[PDB]
Amino acid sequence: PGVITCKAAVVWESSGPVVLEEIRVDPPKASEVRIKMLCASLCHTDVLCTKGFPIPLFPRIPGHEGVGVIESIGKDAKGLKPGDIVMPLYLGECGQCLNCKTGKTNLCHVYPPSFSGLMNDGTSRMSIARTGESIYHFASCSTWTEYAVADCNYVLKINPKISYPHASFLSCGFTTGFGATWRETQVSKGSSVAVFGIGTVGLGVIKGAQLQGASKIIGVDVNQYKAAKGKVFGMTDFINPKDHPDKSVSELVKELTHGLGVDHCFECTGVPSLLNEALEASKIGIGTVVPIGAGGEASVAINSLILFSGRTLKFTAFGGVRTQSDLPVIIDKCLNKEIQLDELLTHEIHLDNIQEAFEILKKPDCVKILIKFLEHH
Amino acid sequence: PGVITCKAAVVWESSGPVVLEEIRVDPPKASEVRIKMLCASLCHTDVLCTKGFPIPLFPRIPGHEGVGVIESIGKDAKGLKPGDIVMPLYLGECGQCLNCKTGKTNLCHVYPPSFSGLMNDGTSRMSIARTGESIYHFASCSTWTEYAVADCNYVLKINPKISYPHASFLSCGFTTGFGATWRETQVSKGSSVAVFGIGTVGLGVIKGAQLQGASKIIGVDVNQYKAAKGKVFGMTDFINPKDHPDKSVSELVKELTHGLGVDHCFECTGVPSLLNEALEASKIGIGTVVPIGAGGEASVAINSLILFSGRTLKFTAFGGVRTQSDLPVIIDKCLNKEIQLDELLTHEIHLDNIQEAFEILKKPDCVKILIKFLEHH
């Protein structure tokens, strides 16, 4: 396989437009695979990338959520082959390092997250066709591009009868929330759960809590449209903070839990002040908070009195989901329809219309946006 | 028993002197006991009280650490009787509430910490003899006084052959650190531990970690005098941050742990910036931090990137030690000499010389100060 010429969405400067460019995609080197994208999606992490956060690397092809088919492989691709359906991964799972051997973490020492925007050898496989200028990728694999190249340890081969839109959603937020309910804290039968923020992450928490038999599942969101979505996934109670401007969120949760708070609180907004509220909403002595959302600031402040309260604060990436061990189990639940993801899909666009996605995500009835591709002939 | 006239150390205003006053101590009411103090001690929490933190309640008799003998009892004193040796408690253990039934917490719903400086009925048992002016107590029992009155649920009857100085030290810091090594995080055989701050709290952590079979126990302190004390209690490695002003504490710990950090880090200084360092010094994915020390500020800041690191942050009061279930076991280890506390005792004063304690605590060779009392005739 030679160099492929295709289209990709490129951002050239912080807060600049995302524009369609003709690019070249080099063939995969050793331990790489080249993927034809089947569909993609978008979350807040992609928006941050267009503003140069965390690292301003430009020009850049955004996108980390999606699914594709292997078009070609380098040497030593660990059994991957053309025609396999794969989803890109945030981090790998070597199964042999000190962290993998514990069974207690998904934070593999050997395949950790990357922030370089480049392949393992410090070069890019993607370049502007007109100039040859090198383009940074996003995370371990750009998905807003007709073709991408990834390290074989950062893709997961998946069952080919999973729907591609649903696999795209399981490559990030819903899986993060769903997995957190047994990998980061053990939601048990009869326990109480509160979920701050009812986007795809919070909907994953809600469904995970429901499948674990939580008997009270409180969703909190300022967007009233989210209440019906939460109910579909198992939410038992809804709080809109804007209905009570003189009450704190933790006060409102305690009102539903006999003044005690919940066993497990999941922070799925990223709003910095809501970390403190999540802690105050969980039970003294036996409550756990998992802060999934990110606020993008330098540090986050915790009321110093919470340090005496016996609560457990469990830090977390990708919901504690191990990407080779646990992620296939979640996909299988989707295949077997134990989880139903159709209600996540609210909007569809094609890649040429990528700029419209940044307006669509502001709409109150948006949950997940699907990005579709055209075929070359 | 009538009203007792005795001496007590009183602070009249924030940052004022601590002065000996003649006071009156009323007899115990229902569910109270009156105690003759045998000895007392001092920690930073008492210093804060003289500066009006957390609540400026004056006039006040400071002191929460000590041991005494019951002089008289109210009705319904739950089996306590004159002549019992008791230590005052920060919080009780009812054994029947939702939190007590879990076995997972010492934060009893029925006997929580008090901040009122007053008895359960909103009055004081202590007053200035010359005026009758009411005096606030400290915590659940003032100890810088020849006689005190406490709610019977906030004292623990102890074995009368325990040494009174050692029991005084076990009423607070050493017990907090020691208990944290199995109640808040489970230090296991062969694990690594780092301890920031080697006062009585950190020395308790070190000894608890040693008894649990931790194979590396790193003590961190800017006071070089503490290194020898740490070694007596089981410390294997010592770091003085001042020896490397261009390296962070977490960097120095990682240098001793193959770049990984420790399984369990205990923050025993209260220095706000050291909470972040404790987290960075613990292992990604599988490390736990217990922040025991208090900084007395409104909030504490955590580097936002730590929220992705898989670490566990376990909040805590009194080291997770349940005051009726776990505290007697710790006392018994002291009786059976499995823990040796003689090295804690560095300075002794009598109550009349209480003002000198605030200078003694600044001395680099101070660990614990014992406060002694005279008898009335």
Ligand SMILES: NC(=O)c1ccc[n+]([C@@H]2O[C@H](COP(=O)([O-])OP(=O)(O)OC[C@H]3O[C@@H](n4cnc5c(N)ncnc54)[C@H](O)[C@@H]3O)[C@@H](O)[C@H]2O)c1
């Ligand atoms: N862990 C991941 O994979 C991932 C991916 C993208 C973004 N994030 C961070 O995690 C959060 C959740 O991700 P998402 O895809 O589900 O985002 P989302 O935007 O779809 O959901 C966020 C929800 O929080 C609600 N919300 C915002 N502010 C609120 C407030 N002050 N009080 C109550 N509700 C509020 C919004 O209405 C929205 O429904 C994001 O807000 C962002 O901070 C995490």
Ligand SMILES: NC(=O)c1ccc[n+]([C@@H]2O[C@H](COP(=O)([O-])OP(=O)(O)OC[C@H]3O[C@@H](n4cnc5c(N)ncnc54)[C@H](O)[C@@H]3O)[C@@H](O)[C@H]2O)c1
């Ligand atoms: N949990 C409790 O029961 C309790 C009681 C009193 C005070 N406190 C808080 O907990 C801390 C520990 O209590 P303690 O009785 O053992 O206090 P302590 O003062 O006897 O010990 C604190 C030790 O930390 C060291 N230290 C201070 N700043 C440091 C720095 N920047 N880097 C490295 N070492 C530093 C000091 O040298 C000292 O050896 C106190 O500092 C205070 O914040 C807790």
Ligand code: NA
């Ligand atoms: Na590679």
Ligand code: NA
């Ligand atoms: Na396609």
Ligand code: NA
């Ligand atoms: Na998002």
Ligand code: NA
């Ligand atoms: Na996040």
Ligand code: NA
């Ligand atoms: Na009482």
Ligand code: NA
């Ligand atoms: Na005495």
Ligand code: NA
């Ligand atoms: Na102290």
Ligand code: NA
């Ligand atoms: Na403390």
Ligand SMILES: [Zn+2]
């Ligand atoms: Zn995402």
Ligand SMILES: [Zn+2]
């Ligand atoms: Zn690994």
Ligand SMILES: [Zn+2]
């Ligand atoms: Zn103390």
Ligand SMILES: [Zn+2]
């Ligand atoms: Zn109780």
